[PDB]
Structure formats: structure tokens, C-alpha cells
Design a binder for these strands. Structure first.
Lengths: 117, 229, 52, 245
RNA sequence: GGACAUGGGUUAGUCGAUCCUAAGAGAUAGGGAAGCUCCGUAUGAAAGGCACGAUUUUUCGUGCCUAUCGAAAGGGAAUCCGGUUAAUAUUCCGGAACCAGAAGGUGGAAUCAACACGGCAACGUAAAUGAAGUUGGAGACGUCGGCGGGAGCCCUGG
RNA sequence: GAGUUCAGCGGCUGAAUCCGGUGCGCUCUCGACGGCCCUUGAAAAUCCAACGGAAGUG
RNA sequence: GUGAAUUACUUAAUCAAUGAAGCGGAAUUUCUAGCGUUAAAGUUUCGCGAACUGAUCCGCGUUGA
């Protein structure tokens, strides 16, 4: 007994993939980790003034790092909590990140501890 | 009787309350494979079927079919597992040093397979032939009633190649042939043969000249009935 | 307001407390009510006429 | 030597400009309600359809099978107004605006948007001020003879429908356009068919008429019906030319 | 010196893109074509959902009805001021906001007359439940011509 | 407290930033209208509301 | 391709519509720009529980030329 003039195809059981082997012998290591995110800090005169004025570190950062991965990499590499991240792709095709540190920490001591001053 | 249970009848006339859900089966846009099945059945009902093909539309009756299948199920062939146990039992018998002939009795089973049954009919070794009515392509069995008639082999056209398959442990079987039965069932086969012969072989001459088909649909039949009236 | 700016308002600020309020004007609603009642009385009086 | 302007009219930039169209003007689909009874609709609004001389009516009908409202775009007839009820079907009254089968209407009635064959939803008598006249009936063969706006008489199935009355907007061609700008605007909202350059003003490569030291055709302008597409210019298969002096 | 050499320089939840669709491009279904590919865009397609139930012979029953791309001048969530640099800013700094989404919490209202009252009314209120289904509205629209109001500029009295 | 102007000190301290008129004025906008057309002047995403009444110490 | 004594038939193919919605048989809604859906009465079994009819059956060839 059909009350609709259309015939819709019935639903069938759709088994999920249960492979007999793994297509990859070993899963790849995380290809974008903290050390690959941060390449090296920028130490130009403009970068130094941002350190001493805006409490902002300036880093040469990987292209595929977003503001979230930059924040975690900085927190893991330097144990400092950033309050803001601003990124730009420099005319030479390299990402530069302005990492504004929290008011509790100063960029000067962080810079000396890194050693790039 | 609660007075609040007031009747609210719905009029379903043209322009009245919304039409109720009715059976719309005859108007459903069925899938193409469904339409192809049903319209193929209609062409076979409409078109003038040649007698060699139309003879397959008249099959064995229900009572004789049940009687035939009762006899057949006593002579189903050995299954794979039963063959394996019998084969192993013969192996230990040979290992024990016994004749392979006397260990196992002579088989008594239905003969199946189109080519094997055809050879049996041509050699007059088959005493009964059961031809499936729904073999596709039909040419695989169109010649069989004539071949059975020339060699005088009693033949019946039975429904459901699937039923023949279940007898011989397969899915479908084109034909079944009974060559030898035990003396207990010799009377039963003879009674079946007589009924099958009187039903099919005697009527073979008349059926060879009876073209099938020619049935028109209900709508045209009713329209022509009105014209005649 | 712009379409999405209607989503910030409260419920009573986007409608009017009346049947169809916020979808129809008051005069339109009044015509709906009187025409509904009058035609209903007709279908009753036509039914009473045709039932006998 | 090149294909002519007539041959390039196959599409492309000669398509109809349908950006502003207010819907295709069609009758209701011939359903059970409209075959065995009638169904009532309300004229929501009469609108102007760009590229068309006749106004269109947005008549809203109730769906007889489902809880929703069907809206049908009709060719408005003179006298149609917003809020008017339109009855479509076999038992519809013979009132201007209603839709009835031609077999249910007496001889001499004036109808429009007539179906050629029942179920195509309107073919004959649709331009503004045009109509079709019921000439006669043939019940034995179930056919109806009608007179078309061109005067040609045609036999249609008696179940074909037609809107009672004449199409609104009559007299549109009674007023001269007065200037090429009015012709320019009239034809923007239609195909690319204006302005029309004469073939005599073209070259031998551009047209059969073109060429010569004078603007003359050079051959008879009545061409056979059998001529090739590039040859079929002028008066095609003309049975009689000239004025009826 | 827009040359030459070495360095430095472009920071956005709010500005754009991204999202939307336009004309139009365009796979799939299908049909052509020796083919390259062509036609096609809800078409002659089984083109996908949703809710009920002590759990149903512990082998699932019962109802309910459209790709994608295509706009940095179209549609459209929400940011302003002051300042700062040799070069960046509605992006940085100082101050001051806003929008979208998420979660529970405080306070208030309604509630055992379950889903607030007032005004004749147009409607108002700090709240004032509303599934499916239907429908309406905003987005959403030409052009010219004066007339009225506002803001900024202009003019002007101390 | 900002910006601006001005007067002092060796970065700091004083003041002022006020009160009004006008218009066939320009620029943008807004409101109420008017005329024109065989020309009647996009879509969709998105957002809201309504009719209906499923459902329901807490 | 099927018939009948010149004509009929429709399954081949052609065409046209749709959301393939009510086809063929028998038994037996029109003074108004409103709303119309999520069945309720009736009849049996065990609270918007089930079941049957409300809404007849049959055929199935989506209908029309």
C-alpha cells in the first residue's frame, strides 16, 4: 500500500571499512611540530623597538603555522603565555609573527634568555 | 456519552477537505527494471506466441506436481558432505583390504543437467523427464518435448526450475530425469508416468498447432465488450 | 532595521499583540475576522437549506 | 560567400532576453478536480510581463491533495481584477475569466488561451486583444471546430480548455511607435531582431540581394519553398504578391 | 634620482577576499560519436531525509515529503577616536566600543486558574513556552522633475 | 585627561578653547509627492514574524 | 505486427503531460481578496493503546491524442 506516487530507493546496511591490512606500515610523525613552527627570532632594529615598547617578540615563522600553532609553540618552547599574535607574510615569502607577551612577563628577559639580543 | 465527543466529518469532494491518503500503487513511477519486468510479461501475454514456446505455458497440474516431487525427494543425489563420508569410508575399507565394489551399494538418484539428460533421452535410458517452464533463454529446452516424443520418453513440463534445483541440491535446474527407481516405487513411477503421458504426450499433436498469446488487456477487453453489447 | 538586525530585538518589539499581529495590519485582520464569520454563517445557512 | 543574417539567427546573441520574465503563462494541469468538477482560485495580482503585450494574472489555487497553495500564472482577460474568483473545470460557470472545456461551451462564445490538444495548457489566442471563437461541435467524433485570430478554422479535442473572454491589453498596435527609440525599447525586452538592415544595402557576400552598381534585387524575390537555407530569402513560397487593388 | 649597492619595511573577529547568487560555465544520469570528445544540467535516474516504538516470532517494524564554479563595483554580522614609525596602520599603542557563537551561574518575571497584564481602539510593556506543516515580510531595486528636513563645507555678529 | 592656539620654566607649570545669527548657497543624504514608458526597471544566501497546537517539588 | 467483411486493434515505434493523483470496470465545493494539514465520530479488543471502517470492491496499462 503506497500513498506516494514516487518510489524512493530503500536504505541498505552500509558496513564501515574493516581493512585486512594497513595501507601504511607506520603512521607519520607530526610533520609540523613546535620546532618546525619557530625558525628563528628576528633581530632587526624595528624588532628590538617592539621588544622594548610593545612587549612583543618577533619570530621568523613557518608559512603553514597559524596563530594557534604559533601560540602553543611559543608556550612550549619558552614557557611564556602570549596574549596576542599578529602574522604577516613578508615580501620575500616568509611568515613573520608579532607575539605580544602577557603583562606578567617582559620580552626583554625572554629575549636575553633566548640569547638573540 | 461525553457531549464533548462531537463528530467532525470530512467531505472529500472536489474542492472540499484535503484528499485522504489512498492507495496510489497503480500510479507509482516504478524503477526501470520493475517496468521492464512487468511490460515484458505483458508482451508475452499480448503477442502471438509460436506453439513451440506456447506449450511451456501449460504446465503440470498441482496434484500431479506434488506427487512427482514426493517421488523425487526420495531420490535426491548425495550431497558433498555425504559423498565425503562415503568416500572416506571406502578409503579405510581399501586400507583394510576390501573390495571397493561391495563396500558401497549402487546409487539410485535423479539425473540432472541439460546435456546429461539430453544424452539419456537420445539413448532411451530416461523413463521420466521434467522440464522447467521458466528456463531463460527458452531455446535451451524448446527442442526437448520433441526429442522426448520421438524417443517415447514420458515428459512433463513442471514449474519452478528453482524447485528442480532444490531437489538436486542446486539453485536452478533446467531438467530432471528419472532413469531407475527401486521396486518399491516402481508402481509409483508407473502411475506418475501414466498420468503425465495422458496429460502431455497424447496432447502433443494438438498442442503443436495451438498458437499462444492473443490475450488483450482489461481496458480494451471491457471496451470491446461494451461495443458488442 | 536590516534583516539580521531584527534578530537582536526582543520578541514584543518585532510584533504586535493581536491575532496575526506583526504579519497583517489591523484593518486587514478585521477584514479577515468579519469575512471569516460571515462566510461561515452562509455555509451553515446553505447546509440548512439543502438538508431539507 | 558568408552565411547570411538569417542563417546566424540559430541562437547565441539572438536568444530571448528572459531576465525580467514574470513566469510562463500557462493553464492549470488537467487534474481530476478540473476534469470532473471545478476548482476556485483567487486573483492575487495583475502584473506586467516585460516583452509581452498582455498583463499576467497570479491566481492562487488550493492543492487538492496536499496542505499548500498552488499559484498559477494566467494570461489576464479584460475585466479581471484583484480578488476575483476564477473557477476552472468542467462544471465552471460560463463567466469571463473561467476555464472550461471547449465541449462545454456553446457556439459563438469568445475564448482565449485555448489548448490545441487537451493538456498542453494554452496555445491559441494569447496575444493582447486576440481570441478564439467556438464555431461548432461534433459530438460523434468528440471534436470542436474553432476560428483562430488569423481566421483559420481548426479542429480541436472537445476536452481542450480555454479561458472565457478576450485577452487584456487590446489595441496595443493601434498607436504608432512614433520613433526609433520606442522601437528600441520595445525590442530590448525581446530578442535581438532590431534594427533591420535591408539586403540590397549589403554586398554579394552578405546576401543574395546585395551587390550591383544600383540597389536592385537582380532576380525574382519569390523563392521556392525547396530552396536552401542560404537561398531562402525574400518572399518564401509566395502564392500571390502585390496589393489587392 | 623611480638609476646603482647594502639593509630595513606591509601586523585586522570588525577593511576586502572567503559566504551568496547573476548572466554564464559545468561534472554526474543518459544518448551520440572510429575517436579526440560532443550534447545534456531534476533530464526517460532506485538521485535523501525525519519521527515514533517496554524490544519486533531477541533476523525492524510504523507513519510522514536541485552538484559545483561564477561579482575585491551587486547581496552581505560587527570599530571608532587620539597617538606612534625613516618607511605600516579603521590592522600597532593608549582609551573607548561592537557582532557572532557556546556553556552553565547570579538577579527578575510567569507558573497547581500550566503558558503576563493594560488601552474603546490604533497599540504598549523588562520578561510573557510553541514541534511538524503552511504562509507573509525584509534582503529587493528604473528614470526625471521640483519641494521640505538634516549633516559637513561656505557666509556672518560679538 | 585628547586635539589646537598662546604665555612662562629647565621635561615641567600657567591660561584659552566662548556666545550667537543666516540662506532660490554647494556636497551628500533623508522625507513627502509629481511625471514618463507597446521601456514597468535581478536573483539567491541570510534574518524575522505569523496561522496552527505536538508536547510539558518541578 | 494482430484481426474482421473493406475496416478494426495496440504491444512496435512517434508524440504530449505530470509530483507518472484518482484510468477502466462492477457493486451502488459559485452574494464576499478568510481558515482549511499533524482524523473524530462509529464498530470491536487490550490510553490521543491497538484493529476495522471512516475514505466500497475489482483490474493494474501513469494518463491523453
Amino acid at each position: 500500500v503506497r500513498t506516494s506516487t514516487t518510489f524512493r530507493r530503500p536504505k541498505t546496511l552500509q558496513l564501515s571499512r574493516k581493512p585486512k591490512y594497513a595501507r601504511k606500515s607506520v603512521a607519520h610523525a607530526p610533520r609540523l611540530d613546535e620546532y618546525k613552527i619557530i625558525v628563528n627570532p628576528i633581530n632587526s632594529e624595528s624588532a628590538m623597538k617592539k621588544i622594548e615598547d610593545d612587549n612583543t617578540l618577533v619570530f621568523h615563522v613557518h608559512l603553514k603555522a597559524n596563530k594557534f600553532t604559533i601560540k602553543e609553540a611559543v608556550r612550549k618552547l619558552y614557557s611564556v603565555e602570549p596574549v596576542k599574535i599578529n602574522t604577516l607574510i613578508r615580501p620575500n615569502g616568509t611568515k613573520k609573527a608579532f607575539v605580544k607577551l602577557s603583562a606578567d612577563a617582559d620580552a626583554l628577559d625572554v629575549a636575553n634568555r633566548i640569547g638573540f639580543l | 456519552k461525553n457531549p464533548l465527543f462531537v463528530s467532525r466529518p470530512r467531505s472529500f469532494g472536489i474542492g472540499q477537505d484535503i484528499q485522504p491518503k489512498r492507495d496510489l500503487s497503480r500510479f507509482v513511477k516504478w524503477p526501470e527494471y520493475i517496468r521492464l519486468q512487468r511490460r515484458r510479461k505483458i508482451l508475452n501475454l499480448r503477442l502471438k506466441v509460436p506453439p513451440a514456446i506456447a506449450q511451456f505455458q501449460k504446465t503440470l497440474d498441482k496434484n500431479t506436481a506434488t506427487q512427482v516431487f514426493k517421488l523425487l525427494n526420495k531420490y535426491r543425489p548425495e550431497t558433498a558432505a555425504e559423498k565425503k563420508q562415503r568416500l572416506v569410508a571406502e578409503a579405510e575399507a581399501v586400507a583394510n583390504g576390501k573390495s571397493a565394489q561391495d563396500v558401497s551399494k549402487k546409487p539410485y538418484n535423479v539425473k540432472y543437467g541439460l546435456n546429461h539428460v539430453v544424452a539419456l533421452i537420445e539413448a532411451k535410458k530416461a523413463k521420466l523427464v521434467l522440464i522447467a517452464s521458466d528456463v531463460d533463454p527458452i531455446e535451451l529446452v524448446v527442442f526437448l518435448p520433441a526429442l522426448c516424443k520421438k524417443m517415447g520418453v514420458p515428459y512433463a513440463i513442471v514449474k519452478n526450475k528453482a524447485r528442480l534445483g532444490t531437489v538436486i541440491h542446486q539453485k536452478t535446474a533446467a531438467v530432471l530425469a528419472v532413469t531407475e527407481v527401486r521396486e518399491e516405487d516402481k508402481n509409483e513411477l508407473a502411475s506418475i508416468v501414466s498420468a503425465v503421458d495422458a496429460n502431455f504426450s497424447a496432447k502433443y499433436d494438438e498442442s503443436r498447432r495451438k498458437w499462444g498469446g492473443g490475450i488483450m488487456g482489461g481496458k480494451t477487453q471491457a471496451l470491446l465488450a461494451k461495443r458488442a453489447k | 532595521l536590516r534583516p539580521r538586525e531584527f534578530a537582536r530585538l526582543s520578541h514584543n518589539k518585532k510584533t504586535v499583540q493581536r491575532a496575526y499581529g506583526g504579519c497583517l495590519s489591523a484593518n486587514a485582520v478585521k477584514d479577515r475576522i468579519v469575512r471569516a464569520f460571515l462566510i461561515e454563517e452562509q455555509k451553515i445557512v446553505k447546509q440548512k437549506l439543502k438538508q431539507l | 560567400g558568408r552565411v547570411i543574417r538569417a542563417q546566424r539567427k540559430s541562437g547565441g546573441i539572438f536568444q530571448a532576453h528572459t531576465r525580467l520574465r514574470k513566469g510562463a503563462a500557462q493553464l492549470r494541469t488537467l487534474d481530476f478536480a478540473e476534469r470532473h468538477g471545478y476548482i476556485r482560485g483567487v486573483v492575487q495580482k495583475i502584473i506586467h510581463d516585460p516583452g509581452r503585450g498582455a498583463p499576467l494574472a497570479k491566481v492562487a489555487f488550493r492543492n487538492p491533495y496536499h496542505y499548500r497553495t498552488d499559484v498559477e500564472t494566467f494570461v489576464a482577460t479584460e475585466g479581471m481584477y484583484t480578488g476575483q474568483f476564477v473557477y476552472c473545470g468542467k462544471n465552471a460557470a460560463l463567466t469571463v475569466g473561467n476555464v472550461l472545456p471547449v465541449g462545454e461551451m456553446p457556439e459563438g462564445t469568445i475564448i482565449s488561451n485555448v489548448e490545441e490538444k487537451a493538456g498542453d495548457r494554452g496555445a491559441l489566442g494569447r496575444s493582447s486583444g486576440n481570441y478564439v471563437i467556438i464555431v461548432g461541435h461534433d459530438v460523434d467524433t468528440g471534436k470542436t471546430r474553432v476560428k483562430l485570430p488569423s481566421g483559420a478554422k481548426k479542429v480541436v479535442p472537445s476536452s481542450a480548455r480555454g479561458v472565457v473572454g478576450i485577452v487584456a491589453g487590446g489595441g496595443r498596435i493601434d498607436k504608432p511607435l512614433l520613433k526609433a527609440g520606442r522601437a528600441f525599447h520595445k525590442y530590448r525586452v525581446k530578442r535581438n531582431c532590431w534594427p533591420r538592415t535591408r539586403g540590397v544595402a549589403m554586398n554579394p557576400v552578405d546576401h543574395p540581394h546585395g551587390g550591383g552598381n544600383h540597389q536592385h534585387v537582380g532576380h525574382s524575390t519569390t523563392v521556392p519553398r525547396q530552396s536552401a537555407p542560404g537561398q531562402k530569402v525574400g518572399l518564401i513560397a509566395a502564392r500571390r504578391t502585390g496589393l489587392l487593388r
